[PDB]
Amino acid sequence: VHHQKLVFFAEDVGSNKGAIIGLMVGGVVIA
Amino acid sequence: VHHQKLVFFAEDVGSNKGAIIGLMVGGVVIA
Amino acid sequence: VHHQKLVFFAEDVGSNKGAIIGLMVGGVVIA
Amino acid sequence: VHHQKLVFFAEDVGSNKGAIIGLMVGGVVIA
Amino acid sequence: VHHQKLVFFAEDVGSNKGAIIGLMVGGVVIA
Amino acid sequence: VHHQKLVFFAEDVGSNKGAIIGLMVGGVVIA
Amino acid sequence: VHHQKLVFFAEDVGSNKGAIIGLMVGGVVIA
Amino acid sequence: VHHQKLVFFAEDVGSNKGAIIGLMVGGVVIA
Amino acid sequence: VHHQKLVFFAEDVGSNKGAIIGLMVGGVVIA
Amino acid sequence: VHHQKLVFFAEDVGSNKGAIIGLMVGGVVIA
């Protein structure tokens, strides 16, 4: 198994007010 | 198995107010 | 198996208020 | 098996308020 | 097997309030 | 003239993704 | 003239992603 | 003229991601 | 003219990520 | 003219990540 660059942002992000997650194992993610 | 660039944003993102997830194993994702 | 660029955004995204997921294994995704 | 560019957005997206999923294995996706 | 560009949006999308899925294996998708 | 309780929701609403308006005077309401 | 309780929600609302307006005078309301 | 309680939420609101307006005079409200 | 309690929240609000406006005179409100 | 309690929160608010405005005269409010 080989994980790499799960989430990619090639350009600029103005702001983040939610949840940015690459990899999770449980649950209960609420926006 | 070979994971790579699961989520790609080639250009700029104004803002994030929800959930951005590359890979998950459980559940219960609520926007 | 070879996963790559599951979700692609060639241009700019104004905002995100829901759920953006590349790959999931469980369920219970609610918008 | 070779997955690539499951969901493609060639141009800009105004906003997202639902669910954008490239690949899923379970169910219970509610808009 | 070779999957590629399952869902294509050549032009801009105003907004998304439902479910956009490239490939699914289970069911129970509710708009 | 006596306006009261133009729109009533006796029970819980799961979500709103359209337009809920009690009273309007102009037009151009688009769902 | 006597306006009161134009929009009523007797129970809990899960979320709002559209437009909730009690009274408007112009137009151009887009969901 | 007597305005009062134009928009009423008797119970708890989970979240707001749209527009909640009591009274407006212009237009151009976009969800 | 007598304005009072244009927007009422009788119970707790989980979070706000949109726009909550009591009264407006112009326009161009975007969720 | 008599303005009072344009926006009312009877109970606790978990958090605010958008815009809470009592009264406005211009426009260009973006969530």
Short mmCIF file of all heavy atoms in Angstrom, two decimals, chain B residues 1-12 14-15 17-26 29-31:
data_model
loop_
_atom_site.label_atom_id
_atom_site.label_comp_id
_atom_site.label_asym_id
_atom_site.label_seq_id
_atom_site.Cartn_x
_atom_site.Cartn_y
_atom_site.Cartn_z
N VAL B 1 -1.77 -1.97 -4.41
CA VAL B 1 -2.64 -0.81 -4.35
C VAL B 1 -1.81 0.47 -4.32
O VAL B 1 -0.76 0.52 -3.67
CB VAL B 1 -3.59 -0.90 -3.14
CG1 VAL B 1 -2.81 -1.18 -1.87
CG2 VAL B 1 -4.42 0.37 -3.00
N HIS B 2 -2.26 1.49 -5.03
CA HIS B 2 -1.50 2.73 -5.17
C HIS B 2 -2.49 3.89 -5.27
O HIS B 2 -3.10 4.09 -6.33
CB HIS B 2 -0.59 2.67 -6.40
CG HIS B 2 0.59 3.59 -6.32
ND1 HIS B 2 1.67 3.34 -5.52
CD2 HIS B 2 0.86 4.75 -6.97
CE1 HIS B 2 2.56 4.31 -5.66
NE2 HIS B 2 2.09 5.18 -6.54
N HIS B 3 -2.65 4.64 -4.19
CA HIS B 3 -3.52 5.81 -4.16
C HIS B 3 -2.69 7.06 -4.38
O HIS B 3 -1.57 7.18 -3.87
CB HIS B 3 -4.25 5.91 -2.82
CG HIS B 3 -5.25 4.82 -2.59
ND1 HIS B 3 -5.73 4.49 -1.34
CD2 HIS B 3 -5.86 3.98 -3.46
CE1 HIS B 3 -6.59 3.50 -1.45
NE2 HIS B 3 -6.69 3.17 -2.72
N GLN B 4 -3.26 8.01 -5.13
CA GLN B 4 -2.53 9.23 -5.45
C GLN B 4 -3.49 10.28 -5.97
O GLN B 4 -4.30 9.99 -6.86
CB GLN B 4 -1.43 8.96 -6.48
CG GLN B 4 -0.52 10.14 -6.75
CD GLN B 4 0.70 9.75 -7.55
OE1 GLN B 4 0.85 8.59 -7.95
NE2 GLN B 4 1.58 10.71 -7.79
N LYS B 5 -3.41 11.49 -5.42
CA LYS B 5 -4.19 12.64 -5.88
C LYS B 5 -5.68 12.33 -5.89
O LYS B 5 -6.37 12.53 -6.89
CB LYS B 5 -3.71 13.11 -7.25
CG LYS B 5 -2.31 13.69 -7.24
CD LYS B 5 -1.97 14.33 -8.57
CE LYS B 5 -0.62 15.01 -8.53
NZ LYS B 5 0.47 14.04 -8.23
N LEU B 6 -6.19 11.85 -4.76
CA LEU B 6 -7.60 11.46 -4.69
C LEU B 6 -8.51 12.64 -4.97
O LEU B 6 -9.51 12.51 -5.68
CB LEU B 6 -7.91 10.85 -3.33
CG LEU B 6 -7.14 9.58 -3.00
CD1 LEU B 6 -7.67 8.95 -1.72
CD2 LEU B 6 -7.21 8.60 -4.15
N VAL B 7 -8.19 13.81 -4.43
CA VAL B 7 -8.95 15.03 -4.67
C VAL B 7 -7.99 16.08 -5.21
O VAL B 7 -6.96 16.36 -4.59
CB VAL B 7 -9.65 15.53 -3.40
CG1 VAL B 7 -10.42 16.80 -3.70
CG2 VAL B 7 -10.57 14.46 -2.86
N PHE B 8 -8.34 16.67 -6.35
CA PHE B 8 -7.47 17.60 -7.04
C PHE B 8 -8.20 18.91 -7.28
O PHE B 8 -9.34 18.91 -7.76
CB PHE B 8 -6.99 17.01 -8.38
CG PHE B 8 -5.74 17.64 -8.90
CD1 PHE B 8 -4.54 16.96 -8.83
CD2 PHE B 8 -5.76 18.89 -9.47
CE1 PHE B 8 -3.38 17.52 -9.32
CE2 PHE B 8 -4.61 19.46 -9.96
CZ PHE B 8 -3.42 18.78 -9.88
N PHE B 9 -7.55 20.02 -6.95
CA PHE B 9 -8.07 21.36 -7.21
C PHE B 9 -7.04 22.09 -8.07
O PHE B 9 -6.06 22.63 -7.54
CB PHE B 9 -8.34 22.11 -5.91
CG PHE B 9 -9.57 21.65 -5.20
CD1 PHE B 9 -9.49 20.72 -4.19
CD2 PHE B 9 -10.81 22.17 -5.53
CE1 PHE B 9 -10.62 20.30 -3.52
CE2 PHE B 9 -11.94 21.75 -4.87
CZ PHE B 9 -11.85 20.82 -3.87
N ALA B 10 -7.26 22.11 -9.38
CA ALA B 10 -6.28 22.70 -10.28
C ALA B 10 -6.20 24.21 -10.13
O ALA B 10 -5.15 24.80 -10.43
CB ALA B 10 -6.61 22.34 -11.73
N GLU B 11 -7.26 24.86 -9.67
CA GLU B 11 -7.29 26.30 -9.54
C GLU B 11 -7.68 26.71 -8.13
O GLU B 11 -7.87 25.87 -7.25
CB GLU B 11 -8.23 26.93 -10.57
CG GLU B 11 -7.70 26.88 -11.99
CD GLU B 11 -6.49 27.76 -12.19
OE1 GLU B 11 -6.29 28.70 -11.40
OE2 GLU B 11 -5.72 27.50 -13.14
N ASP B 12 -7.78 28.01 -7.92
CA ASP B 12 -7.96 28.56 -6.58
C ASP B 12 -9.37 28.29 -6.06
O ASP B 12 -10.35 28.33 -6.81
CB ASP B 12 -7.68 30.06 -6.59
CG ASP B 12 -8.23 30.75 -7.83
OD1 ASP B 12 -8.37 30.07 -8.87
OD2 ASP B 12 -8.52 31.96 -7.76
N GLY B 14 -12.22 29.61 -3.43
CA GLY B 14 -12.60 30.81 -2.71
C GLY B 14 -12.66 30.63 -1.21
O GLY B 14 -12.11 31.44 -0.46
N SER B 15 -13.31 29.56 -0.77
CA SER B 15 -13.44 29.28 0.66
C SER B 15 -14.02 27.88 0.82
O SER B 15 -14.63 27.33 -0.09
CB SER B 15 -14.32 30.31 1.37
OG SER B 15 -15.63 30.31 0.82
N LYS B 17 -16.44 25.78 3.61
CA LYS B 17 -17.29 25.78 4.79
C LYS B 17 -17.96 24.43 5.01
O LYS B 17 -18.80 24.31 5.91
CB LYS B 17 -18.35 26.88 4.68
CG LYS B 17 -17.76 28.27 4.60
CD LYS B 17 -18.82 29.34 4.63
CE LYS B 17 -18.19 30.72 4.56
NZ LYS B 17 -19.19 31.80 4.71
N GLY B 18 -17.61 23.42 4.23
CA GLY B 18 -18.14 22.09 4.43
C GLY B 18 -17.06 21.11 4.84
O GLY B 18 -16.26 21.41 5.73
N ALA B 19 -17.03 19.94 4.21
CA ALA B 19 -16.05 18.92 4.51
C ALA B 19 -15.37 18.48 3.23
O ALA B 19 -16.04 18.09 2.27
CB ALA B 19 -16.69 17.72 5.20
N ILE B 20 -14.04 18.53 3.21
CA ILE B 20 -13.24 18.05 2.10
C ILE B 20 -12.43 16.87 2.62
O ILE B 20 -11.54 17.04 3.47
CB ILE B 20 -12.32 19.13 1.52
CG1 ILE B 20 -13.15 20.34 1.08
CG2 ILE B 20 -11.53 18.59 0.36
CD1 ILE B 20 -12.32 21.43 0.46
N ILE B 21 -12.72 15.68 2.11
CA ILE B 21 -12.11 14.45 2.58
C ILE B 21 -11.54 13.70 1.39
O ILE B 21 -12.23 13.53 0.38
CB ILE B 21 -13.12 13.57 3.34
CG1 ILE B 21 -13.76 14.37 4.48
CG2 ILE B 21 -12.44 12.33 3.88
CD1 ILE B 21 -14.99 13.72 5.05
N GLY B 22 -10.30 13.25 1.51
CA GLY B 22 -9.69 12.47 0.45
C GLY B 22 -10.13 11.02 0.48
O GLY B 22 -10.54 10.46 -0.53
N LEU B 23 -10.04 10.41 1.66
CA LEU B 23 -10.40 9.01 1.82
C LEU B 23 -10.91 8.80 3.24
O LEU B 23 -10.36 9.34 4.19
CB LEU B 23 -9.21 8.10 1.54
CG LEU B 23 -9.36 6.62 1.88
CD1 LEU B 23 -10.54 6.02 1.14
CD2 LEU B 23 -8.09 5.87 1.56
N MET B 24 -11.97 8.00 3.37
CA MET B 24 -12.55 7.70 4.67
C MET B 24 -12.82 6.20 4.75
O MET B 24 -13.00 5.52 3.74
CB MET B 24 -13.84 8.48 4.91
CG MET B 24 -15.08 7.81 4.37
SD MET B 24 -16.54 8.82 4.60
CE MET B 24 -15.97 10.34 3.87
N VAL B 25 -12.85 5.70 5.99
CA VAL B 25 -13.15 4.29 6.22
C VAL B 25 -14.44 4.08 6.99
O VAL B 25 -15.13 3.06 6.77
CB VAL B 25 -11.98 3.61 6.95
CG1 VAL B 25 -12.16 2.10 6.96
CG2 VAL B 25 -10.66 3.99 6.30
N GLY B 26 -14.84 4.99 7.87
CA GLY B 26 -16.10 4.84 8.58
C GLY B 26 -17.25 5.49 7.85
O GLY B 26 -17.41 5.28 6.64
N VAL B 29 -20.66 11.15 7.77
CA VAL B 29 -20.21 12.46 7.32
C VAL B 29 -21.41 13.33 7.01
O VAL B 29 -22.23 13.00 6.14
CB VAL B 29 -19.29 12.32 6.09
CG1 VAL B 29 -19.07 13.68 5.46
CG2 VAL B 29 -17.98 11.71 6.50
N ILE B 30 -21.52 14.44 7.72
CA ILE B 30 -22.68 15.32 7.63
C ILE B 30 -22.22 16.68 7.14
O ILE B 30 -21.31 17.29 7.72
CB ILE B 30 -23.40 15.45 8.99
CG1 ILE B 30 -23.93 14.09 9.44
CG2 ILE B 30 -24.52 16.47 8.90
CD1 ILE B 30 -24.70 14.14 10.74
N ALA B 31 -22.85 17.16 6.07
CA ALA B 31 -22.55 18.48 5.55
C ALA B 31 -23.32 19.54 6.32
O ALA B 31 -23.84 19.28 7.40
CB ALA B 31 -22.88 18.56 4.07
#
